[PDB]
């Protein structure tokens with residue numbers, strides 16, 4: 197049993213809800229929250245800006261030190277950093293950004309990072325400002341992630357479309 201509440205069950209391991217990721221993380225304090233990161237860990241908008249704003253910019257300060265030491269992530273890659281006031285850990289995952297011309301086949305590689313964690317709170321990778329089709333992102337998630345993933349969808353309209361169209 198876990199603390200996650202109000203989710204629709206899509207598969208054995210994937211659950212979905214209409215939820216602002218900041219508010220859900222604040223309520224649950226999950227072991228892992230996933231950030232929709234870029235390779236520079238520049239958390240300017242979307243999930244990254246929302247999460248970082250909720251940490252009072254502590255996520256960005258930590259991220260800048262990580263990049264100064266390690267250099268940029270790979271598209272499809274990840275790193276584990278603090279969850280600050282939101283979670284124990286934040287898994288920063290870089291999905292391909294279609295608005296930068298990145299290979300959508302890298303979305304599967306991005307989701308494979310989730311399999312290193314038994315339970316996660318996450319957004320759909322490469323959707324929204326990253327430019328991918330969220331229906332596609334949900335299909336790759338279900339077909340790639342084997343650990344237990346609780347997906348938060350921000351827009352009530354998109355949530356309803358993802359559920360209605362789910363095979």
Ligand SMILES: Cn1cnc2c(N)nc(N)nc21
Nearest residue numbers: 216217242243246324348350
């Ligand atoms: C895609 N996107 C942008 N902002 C958010 C947010 N606050 N919450 C969730 N679940 N998704 C988001």
